Amino acid sequence: DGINQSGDKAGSTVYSAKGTSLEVGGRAEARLSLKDGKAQDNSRVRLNFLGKAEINDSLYGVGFYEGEFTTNDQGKNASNNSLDNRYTYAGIGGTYGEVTYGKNDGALGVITDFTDIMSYHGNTAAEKIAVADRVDNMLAYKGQFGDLGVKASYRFADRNAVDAMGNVVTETNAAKYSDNGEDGYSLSAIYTFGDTGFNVGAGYADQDDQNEYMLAASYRMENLYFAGLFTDGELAKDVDYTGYELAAGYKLGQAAFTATYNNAETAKKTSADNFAIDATYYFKPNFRSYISYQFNLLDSASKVASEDELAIGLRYDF
Amino acid sequence: DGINQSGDKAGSTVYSAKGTSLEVGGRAEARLSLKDGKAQDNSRVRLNFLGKAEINDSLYGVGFYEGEFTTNDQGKNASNNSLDNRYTYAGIGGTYGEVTYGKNDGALGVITDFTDIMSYHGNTAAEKIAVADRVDNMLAYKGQFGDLGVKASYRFADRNAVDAMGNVVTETNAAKYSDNGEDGYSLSAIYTFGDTGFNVGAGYADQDDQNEYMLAASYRMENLYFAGLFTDGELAKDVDYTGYELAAGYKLGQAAFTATYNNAETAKKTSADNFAIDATYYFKPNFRSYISYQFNLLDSDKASKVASEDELAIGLRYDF
Amino acid sequence: DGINQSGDKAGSTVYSAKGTSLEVGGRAEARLSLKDGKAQDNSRVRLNFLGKAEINDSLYGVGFYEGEFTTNDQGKNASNNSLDNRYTYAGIGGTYGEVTYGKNDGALGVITDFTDIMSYHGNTAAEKIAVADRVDNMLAYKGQFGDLGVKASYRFADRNAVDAMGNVVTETNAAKYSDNGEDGYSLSAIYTFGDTGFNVGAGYADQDDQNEYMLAASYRMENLYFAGLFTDGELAKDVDYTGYELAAGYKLGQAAFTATYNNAETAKKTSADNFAIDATYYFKPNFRSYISYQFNLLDASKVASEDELAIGLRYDF
């Protein structure tokens, strides 16, 4: 929402009665991708259901689901069984923040959000490890204390069943329970400096052989926005990752224009090097069109890995 | 909707404010199929979500999703992951019609609608190629100007990633992008002769090695409906297709009765020859029952025993 | 679902006009399972849609869908295509009860509901064969006539297409239609004894080489509840199954406390032996938390005998 143009918007209230509400939201987002003059339909629908029940003025319960649905006809009127259950959680919140269990966001998304401002492109050099991103078996916390926003998460290792040598098997055939070692945590903080338009952010995450930190800053004036983000860590034992993003935005009437630069290195070789620009027209707050171009600055990476991309989108938010 | 009894009904408005509306629709449709005395559960649920944002009095935006959900227990309380994302589109519309991108109908369904009036059977001799039917990677247009309805669609070929010999592979193993050559288009027009009861329609489509035209006409007056449909084309290199449908319908009170004859030939051999009849009772606009029988006129001189079998269907349909 | 805590609650009316209504229901149910100190995310969402069209005072139609959605990331932000279409039916009801076709409950769940009162655990020694449980290609009936509740179902065998030697093949290759022999039926009765707080229940089912009956009784009085359930039958040719279950419940304010003993024997070997206890707190009718512990008394693999702690938070849509 807002400057994070690709993010979900709040849904429509379909039931409300007695501090209890049901909001149905999501989107129908038509997306045409053009690479080497060849089209791919990257359209997606999301459907989401957010229930909130006020328990008292200090406390509320929440439930949330979101699914994403796509097609891949390849030229036939095919049956398309493409579903991703993006979110499945319940939680409790109040004046001291909100805590959930189930698949939900970890702490670093609101840091990557400093530079993730484009309708389609961008966010290519800010890889989030699972516990920092969105993942199940996870306790997720968010709170806002004046000008300070904090998020945190803690993921449990997933239970599995193993034989007497440690091979993973069906429970019926197992000798004992073990786990996959995929416990982890994430933490972030954002400080908004009053009404100045200046925000800073930082965070960290760790999960088995993966770890990272992030630093960001942004400055918002009346119709202009600037931001930078830095990520550094390991994606595996002896696989370094470092990424940098810059973002700029300008708003003119109902239109928003953005540009980003994204550069990442994986194992000390460049893995992303993108300059992208876009334009997004808001007819209404829930109906928009956009056009975006990614200059892919990798070159002879493979031919396919170095191709530029044009994207054209029409987005309706439920 | 309406005379196209198997089609969706408009949904229920659940939200309407600030120039935005949300309609939730779909169906829960219980369907027992009996062939050679043997029962198959053909029940299906649809759920759909239609969003409309009024921009000004001659402009609006739309978003639409429809999913179909079924079971196939085969005698066990099974876990059933059966989903078909039937429609996923967004569009912009207004005085000059509506255009969408994403999986949506092409132009010929409104032509097949002339004879596709039964609750379960019919529509067996009017095959639509993908771009004419419903398919993704497609821009789809529809407009109604007085008594003239027009539709058009254009589908792009799908990009793929290939190796040095053109075999489709993952993007990491690929030498280059290519495409599948599945571009195409469709077009149609329907003229409704105001209150006379007469309608005429035609259309055309073309996609890769397939093409077809359709012609149709109908008469509706005072609870009676008659129609005919002709389709002719090619479904592949060296595979002609010609189909004929006739339809008649009668509405009495809350009941609707229909009959269709459908005859198709594929590569100059009869591939469908069906006479079907049905009765549908509308308890309420969104709750109905029906019974239907298809007399399959194919026989052992032209088709296998299974391909030649008749079908009884019994349904109960609730529309959300 | 009242005392049957793990069951669905009625949904929220999003549309209502002229005796036609649409309810959107379901849950978002966060569930952490801990065994031998190791955690599993058993969280689930349900989404459901119930349409009802009053036709007259004594007649209505219904349509229902429910899906269940889960994740299994295993430590990655995975794409999760996990969907179970639990219910897909339409029906007609009124004075003489309600009849449906499409995937819906058979007759025995209202009997297992005598002791299936826990938030998470319980219902481990009351196996229901498909026709008695929930399955498609089935006609389902329910009706209440004063203090007598009845349910019944009949399942057709599923048609298939076979070659000339009986092997299942695709229709285009087939010689004839056949079926898989999965026809079956179920029946059950519950009698409420007037104003006494006592109910008794019985039912039975049969489907191919599986059959069973169940007997149950319950007492409900003044924030307390007790019940028993017995199940006996066959899960396959020469494969016996016997189960029993005891349950107790106590309600104090917004809190409900339950305990169950469940013991089942499959082919004359103990296959479930569980004592569970829990506590559920209803903050609001549609938001609850719970905690539950299952003492697994089997000691036969180490894994098969492990206890479980569950913690839940449940939002009902």
Coordinates of C-alpha atoms in Angstrom, one line a residue, chain B residues 159-302:
Chain B
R159 CA 7.1 -17.0 -24.3
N160 CA 9.3 -20.0 -23.4
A161 CA 12.9 -20.6 -22.6
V162 CA 14.7 -23.0 -24.9
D163 CA 18.1 -24.8 -25.4
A164 CA 20.2 -24.5 -28.6
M165 CA 17.9 -27.1 -30.3
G166 CA 14.6 -25.4 -29.3
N167 CA 13.7 -27.8 -26.5
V168 CA 11.9 -26.1 -23.7
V169 CA 14.0 -26.0 -20.6
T170 CA 14.4 -24.0 -17.3
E171 CA 15.6 -20.4 -17.7
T172 CA 19.0 -21.4 -16.2
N173 CA 19.6 -24.1 -18.8
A174 CA 18.3 -21.9 -21.7
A175 CA 20.1 -20.5 -24.7
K176 CA 17.4 -18.0 -25.6
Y177 CA 13.6 -17.1 -25.4
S178 CA 11.3 -18.4 -28.0
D179 CA 7.5 -18.9 -28.1
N180 CA 5.0 -21.6 -28.7
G181 CA 3.4 -20.0 -31.8
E182 CA 0.0 -20.0 -30.1
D183 CA -1.1 -16.5 -31.2
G184 CA -4.6 -16.0 -32.5
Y185 CA -7.7 -13.9 -32.7
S186 CA -11.4 -14.1 -32.6
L187 CA -14.3 -11.9 -33.6
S188 CA -18.1 -11.9 -33.4
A189 CA -21.2 -9.9 -33.9
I190 CA -24.8 -10.4 -32.7
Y191 CA -27.7 -8.2 -34.0
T192 CA -30.8 -8.3 -31.9
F193 CA -33.9 -7.3 -33.9
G194 CA -35.3 -5.2 -31.1
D195 CA -38.6 -6.6 -29.7
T196 CA -39.4 -8.9 -32.7
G197 CA -37.9 -11.9 -31.0
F198 CA -35.3 -12.5 -33.8
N199 CA -31.4 -12.5 -33.3
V200 CA -28.6 -13.3 -35.6
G201 CA -25.0 -13.9 -34.9
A202 CA -21.7 -14.8 -36.6
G203 CA -18.0 -15.1 -35.8
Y204 CA -14.6 -16.2 -36.7
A205 CA -11.4 -17.4 -35.1
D206 CA -8.0 -18.5 -35.9
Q207 CA -5.1 -19.9 -33.9
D208 CA -2.0 -21.7 -35.3
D209 CA -3.3 -24.7 -37.2
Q210 CA -6.9 -24.2 -36.2
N211 CA -9.7 -22.0 -37.5
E212 CA -13.5 -21.8 -37.6
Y213 CA -16.5 -19.7 -38.4
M214 CA -19.9 -19.8 -36.8
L215 CA -23.3 -18.7 -37.9
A216 CA -26.4 -18.6 -35.8
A217 CA -30.0 -17.5 -35.5
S218 CA -32.8 -17.6 -33.0
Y219 CA -36.4 -16.6 -32.3
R220 CA -37.8 -16.0 -28.9
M221 CA -41.5 -15.0 -28.2
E222 CA -43.9 -15.5 -25.4
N223 CA -42.1 -18.3 -23.5
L224 CA -41.0 -20.2 -26.7
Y225 CA -37.4 -20.2 -28.0
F226 CA -35.9 -21.9 -31.2
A227 CA -32.4 -21.5 -32.5
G228 CA -29.8 -23.0 -34.9
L229 CA -26.0 -22.9 -35.0
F230 CA -23.5 -23.9 -37.7
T231 CA -19.8 -24.3 -37.1
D232 CA -17.1 -25.1 -39.8
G233 CA -13.4 -25.1 -39.7
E234 CA -10.2 -27.1 -39.0
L235 CA -9.0 -28.4 -35.8
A236 CA -5.6 -29.4 -37.1
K237 CA -3.8 -29.9 -40.3
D238 CA -5.9 -32.4 -42.2
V239 CA -8.7 -32.5 -39.7
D240 CA -11.9 -30.7 -40.9
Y241 CA -14.7 -30.0 -38.4
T242 CA -18.3 -29.2 -39.1
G243 CA -21.0 -29.0 -36.5
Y244 CA -24.8 -28.3 -36.5
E245 CA -27.0 -27.6 -33.4
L246 CA -30.7 -27.0 -33.2
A247 CA -32.4 -25.9 -30.0
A248 CA -36.0 -25.4 -28.7
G249 CA -37.2 -24.3 -25.4
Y250 CA -40.4 -23.6 -23.6
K251 CA -41.0 -21.8 -20.3
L252 CA -44.1 -22.6 -18.3
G253 CA -44.4 -20.9 -14.9
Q254 CA -41.2 -21.6 -13.0
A255 CA -40.3 -24.5 -15.3
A256 CA -38.2 -24.6 -18.4
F257 CA -38.1 -27.4 -20.9
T258 CA -35.5 -27.8 -23.6
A259 CA -34.5 -30.1 -26.5
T260 CA -31.3 -30.0 -28.6
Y261 CA -30.0 -31.9 -31.6
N262 CA -26.3 -31.7 -32.0
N263 CA -24.3 -33.3 -34.9
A264 CA -20.5 -33.0 -35.4
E265 CA -18.1 -34.5 -37.9
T266 CA -14.4 -34.5 -37.4
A267 CA -12.1 -35.6 -40.4
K268 CA -15.3 -36.5 -42.3
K269 CA -16.4 -39.0 -39.6
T270 CA -19.4 -38.4 -37.3
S271 CA -18.0 -37.6 -33.8
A272 CA -21.1 -36.4 -32.0
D273 CA -24.8 -37.2 -32.7
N274 CA -26.9 -36.3 -29.7
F275 CA -30.6 -35.7 -29.1
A276 CA -31.1 -34.5 -25.5
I277 CA -34.1 -33.3 -23.5
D278 CA -34.5 -31.7 -20.1
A279 CA -36.7 -30.1 -17.5
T280 CA -35.5 -27.5 -15.0
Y281 CA -37.5 -26.1 -12.1
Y282 CA -36.7 -22.7 -10.6
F283 CA -37.8 -22.7 -7.0
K284 CA -36.3 -19.3 -6.7
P285 CA -34.1 -17.4 -9.1
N286 CA -31.1 -18.9 -7.4
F287 CA -32.3 -22.4 -6.5
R288 CA -33.3 -24.9 -9.1
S289 CA -33.6 -28.6 -9.9
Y290 CA -33.2 -30.4 -13.2
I291 CA -33.4 -33.7 -15.0
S292 CA -31.8 -34.4 -18.4
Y293 CA -31.3 -37.3 -20.8
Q294 CA -28.9 -37.5 -23.7
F295 CA -29.9 -40.0 -26.4
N296 CA -26.5 -40.7 -28.0
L297 CA -27.2 -41.7 -31.5
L298 CA -23.7 -42.9 -32.4
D299 CA -23.6 -46.7 -32.8
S300 CA -21.1 -49.6 -33.5
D301 CA -20.7 -48.8 -37.2
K302 CA -19.2 -45.4 -36.1

